[PDB]
Subunit: 248 residues, 3 copies
């Protein structure tokens, strides 16, 4: 038996949208100590790790690890119809091919239950990059999102430059060339070396949807190494993305 | 001859929008009692009956029964460009071939007038499915619309089950299966007996636009009988839908 | 060689949208009196003339008249991603083959800079029409914009009839006939004679977007003559459109 109730469905809604943007199916590693989702785009260029610790749920009951694989396409379609202010309980009875989502009015006047079928999803082949990040920049989630959208009016790749002075996002295409410089503090830059890597704006966009979860976003970079985009879900979880640098 | 001035065009705007979306053309039964529209889908599964009693208009003048046929498509377009807070005088003259919608601002500083050509539409073979309903449910028009839209993510058929306890809406499909139960009281139920019938969501959605006209909606049900979705237009008229169940 | 900064980019964002509506490339006559675009549509029936005077900018510098060709398409695509309340400094150095738009935060914490390639625009046949205007209707900018959107539901040609009582905009088509009458007083008419011209609505629509720059619009008319449609920019310049009568 499994049960995770959240006070506000908004979290699940704002979460699945962030993930469905990268992959359309994923396995929910529901183990005691929290609910984890790990997955890679078909390009094998970009990975999402999502942890929700057990302190995140008003009710959480996972005695033994049970992996549940799920169609994010369907799940997303169901969550769209669930009022955010309503409660949401995700429940699985052992040896079921379906998992149950239950929502209730704060008033208890209305109850909605939605049953979705489970899938068989093979375990992610690749795993979190084992890297120590030299340069770390933190900035307002929404500003990050705007910048990617903006840089995309120019090209499909963004050249991020970390410097003591601040980060410079730059891009070029037919429309022409542009850049956005963010003066460091507010932009909290931590640097050991002046690092400057380039990344695919398509994925950066997918990531930026994290603005729905956290007011600020931590971007961690390492020379000739994947990047991490971390979104903190309060101190009750996190959403982390990893993307490959563009190389010549 | 005919003259039907309403103080606020909002009504006509909302009504035509509702009636359109089941039918493209309709005859306006201009009787000295009021205006009436009776019509049926191409599928001939769904009927719409609308009554606007003379009390609804600030100036009704229909000495004799005139049947005016109109393209709801063309009417909807002309109405979309009319401020709802403006007057709307519908008018026809002997053998005019055209109807005249006239609109004025409260300040009488702006006058808009539009002329639409009448169509010849044959009378409706089917008649109001006059019947007595065992069970009668009233709820918030808006919640109804939400429920129909929500159930439409699962399937195209809705199963309504009426119990002293309350009303549950069930739908199934590839996405999976979901249900929304409403606890009886503002859910006002009224069952001389328990009943559970299934309907097409497509036509339910067409009806659910009645919310723009009324904050509550009354649903009447009889076994192996068309249902009725009623929306009261103040005390000046009503909009009624009747739809054939699905039985196996 | 040229620098022109404005406090709020709102103007540029609102201006380019207006003039990108009519033409995709335009030359900017930069000179010490200010910036000036004068362009015709390809059909040669419509002419836009825009003047921003030096006092429009918080900082203007143009010793020598240079002509700059810009792709209003690209310029549009850039200004879309510039915050209204950020400042915008348009600059050009001797034989640079690009202009630089530079965007500063009020708080100076963010700097965006974009470079657009300059075009060689050959069209300069534009000759401001003589202005012996007899009639001068002036009305709310957004009402004129609505009237044209509305008249488009009927036809693609509008007939403006100016009389002592007020102005009538008439249109006809498959949907039917329509007209909006605005009585004089805030409609301010000024005629020497009853005048009635007809005009293409496609262009009147392009012009109407001027409502973003001015709370009021001025239409000037003369028999057999192009009308003028003038949007005042705050006494620091203008946006004027001229359109050939369709009575030809
Ligand atoms: N460079 C010059 N000295 C010059 C050359 C031509 C010109 O033209 C005057 C009449 C026509 C241009 C005034 O605006 C239009 C445009 C198109 C039509 C049409 N084709 N219906 C009607 C009126 C004015 C000045």
């Amino acid at each position: 038996m499994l049960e995770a109730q959240v006070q506000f469905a908004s979290l699940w809604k704002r979460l699945v949208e962030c993930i469905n943007g990268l992959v359309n199916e994923a396995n929910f590693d529901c183990n005691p100590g929290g609910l984890s989702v790990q997955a890679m785009d078909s390009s094998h260029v970009a990975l999402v790790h999502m942890l929700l610790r057990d302190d995140c749920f008003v009710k959480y009951q996972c005695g033994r690890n049970s992996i549940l694989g799920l169609n994010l396409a369907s799940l997303s379609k169901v969550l769209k119809i669930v009022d955010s202010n309503d409660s949401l309980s995700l429940r699985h009875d052992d040896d079921s091919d379906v998992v149950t989502l239950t929502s209730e009015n704060p008033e208890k006047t209305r109850k909605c239950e939605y049953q979705l079928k489970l899938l068989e999803i093979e375990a992610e082949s690749m795993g979190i990059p084992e890297m120590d990040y030299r340069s770390t920049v933190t900035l307002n989630s929404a500003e990050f999102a705007k910048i990617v959208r903006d840089m995309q009016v120019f090209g499909d790749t963004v050249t991020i430059a970390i410097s003591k002075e601040g980060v410079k996002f730059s891009s070029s295409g037919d429309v022409g060339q542009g850049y956005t410089f963010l003066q460091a503090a507010g932009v909290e830059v931590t640097m050991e070396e002046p690092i400057t890597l380039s990344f695919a704006l398509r994925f950066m966009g997918i990531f930026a949807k994290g603005s729905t979860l956290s007011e600020r976003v931590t971007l961690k970079f390492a020379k000739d190494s994947p990047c991490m985009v971390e979104y903190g879900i309060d101190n009750v979880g996190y959403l982390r993305y990893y993307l490959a640098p563009k190389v010549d």
